[PDB]
Specification:
Blueprint lengths: L11 E9 L6 E5 L7 E2 L2 E3 L7 H13 L1 E13 L6 E13 L11 E4 L1 H11 L2 H9 L6
Parallel strand pairs: 1-6
Antiparallel strand pairs: 1-4, 2-3, 2-7, 5-6
The structure holds adenosine-5'-pentaphosphate (5FA), adenine and calcium ion.
Length: 142
């Protein structure tokens, strides 16, 4: 298979982006494939040939959200509390372009959100680890 695991905890290694607008007032969220009313952020499994997390992160942001930007920060890691099953590596991305067409554009909705709506969405989705990643970002909370 094409899936990499932590040799310590055996958690699944995943990378994603907090995609922020230049003014940093909004963050890009996508609907989940499993729970279609739930809003999350682009992320996905690292595969064996990928040389770094940034690669996985930018791949998944393209694939899942049709977003292209530059990585402006490493937001560190966050684990899963449901040992852990998933170790996430997050980066902040400045959005340079949102393309109307992208691999998953038929199986996923996508929208910008202020800090406040995004926080509620992630509590509604029950993803505190993703909210922690969002809180480490330079998003404006006002
Ligand atoms: N708190 C949590 N921590 C870790 N994993 C959690 C989770 N809650 C659900 N999942 C589990 O992660 C997978 C993706 O669900 P998701 O986060 O809603 O993502 P998604 O369904 O939008 O994306 P998928 O197409 O399922 O892809 P994955 O994120 O599994 O990874 P992949 O892109 O490399 O296939 C599912 O099997 C789900 O049960
Ligand atoms: N990058 C980070 N990782 C873990 N805890 C943090 N608290 C603030 N920034 C953090
Ligand atoms: Ca995914």
């Amino acid at each position: 298979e094409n899936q990499v695991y932590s040799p310590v905890t055996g958690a699944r290694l995943v990378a994603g982006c907090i995609c922020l607008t230049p003014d940093k007032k909004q963050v890009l969220m996508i609907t989940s494939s499993a729970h279609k009313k739930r809003w999350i952020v682009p992320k996905g499994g690292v595969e064996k040939d990928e040389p770094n997390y940034e690669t996985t992160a930018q791949r998944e942001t393209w694939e899942e959200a049709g977003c292209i930007g530059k990585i402006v920060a490493n937001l560190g890691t966050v684990e899963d509390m449901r040992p852990p099953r998933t170790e996430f590596h997050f980066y902040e991305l400045e959005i340079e372009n949102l393309l109307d067409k992208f691999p998953e554009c038929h199986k996923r909705h996508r929208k910008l959100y202020s800090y406040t709506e995004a926080k509620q969405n992630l509590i509604d989705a029950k993803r505190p680890e993703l909210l922690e990643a969002l809180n480490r970002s330079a998003i404006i909370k006002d």
